[PDB]
């Protein structure tokens, strides 16, 4: 039974760097270790993918959630639409910032991301291809 993301609210800190969440724009994370039934919320894709490509956590990490920006806008995106990370398409490399800078995209639908990247650039990547590099 796969553990479900959870809504964020205004009090909810990022798991990696501390800061409020809500307050910024730009896709948000969740993810869920073995180790804890409580869900890690993280600020943007970035720390999001930042924690679960680190060794120290690469094992733990289970199910792992991003907001799809095919359905929500970028500076406000929205609780009820958070899709599984595994399965969804990356923008790695855009002129669109979230709240660390830079960010990563995550869209449920391909032509999505493409578009997205018309506009504002980047490269397009599926989960597995997002490594530390990027
Ligand atoms: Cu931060
Ligand atoms: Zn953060």
């Given at each position: 039974?796969?553990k479900?993301?959870q ?8 798991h ?16 869920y270790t073995?180790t804890s039934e409580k869900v890690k919320n ?93």
């Amino acid at each position: 039974p796969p553990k479900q993301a959870q809504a964020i609210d205004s009090t909810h800190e990022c798991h990696l760097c501390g800061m409020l969440i809500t307050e910024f724009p730009g896709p948000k994370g969740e993810l869920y270790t073995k180790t804890s039934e409580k869900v890690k919320n993280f600020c943007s894709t970035r720390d999001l993918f930042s924690f679960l490509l680190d060794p120290e956590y690469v094992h733990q990490v289970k199910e792992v959630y991003v907001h799809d920006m095919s359905l929500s806008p970028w500076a406000k995106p929205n609780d009820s639409h958070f899709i599984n990370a595994r399965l969804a398409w990356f923008v790695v490399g855009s002129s669109q910032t979230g709240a660390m800078g830079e960010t990563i995209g995550s869209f449920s639908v391909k032509k999505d991301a493409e578009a997205f990247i018309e506009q504002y650039g980047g490269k397009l990547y599926r989960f597995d291809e997002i490594t530390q590099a990027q």
